[PDB]
Amino acid sequence: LSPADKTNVKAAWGKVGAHAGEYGAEALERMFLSFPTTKTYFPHFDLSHGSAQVKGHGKKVADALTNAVAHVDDMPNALSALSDLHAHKLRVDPVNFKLLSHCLLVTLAAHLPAEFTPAVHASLDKFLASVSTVLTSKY
């Protein structure tokens, strides 16, 4: 990371603002179309198209990323509690975090094309790359 990258991440995520929960659910849905191996159902979760849990999960992904951006100077500590989550360890395959974070860039750049320059794109790519490795550090 760097001062330029950190500044790009705040500006990009700042312009997202209240629509972060919507893109979090959208990025999760985009992952299944682009990567069909990722799409797998499990008993205690609702993965329908207009699901309440998928929308609820989008807010949880948004609030986690919002916390990560708020404490971007020490990201590992901010996401240490989330990295021990049992739901992820049991249900989610380690690779899918890199695939979801990739699809979030595709979602964010789609909804915010003007502010998303190649410099900002690479800044969020590096930022979202580190968040994937932090959450998959435990397994």
Binding site: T37, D93, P94, V95, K98, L99, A122, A129, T133, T136
Partner: peptide, 11 residues
């Protein structure tokens, strides 16, 4: 150039 190829690797 900034891409890191750590585990878990993508296919």
């Amino acid at each position: 150039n900034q891409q890191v190829f750590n585990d878990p690797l993508v296919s």
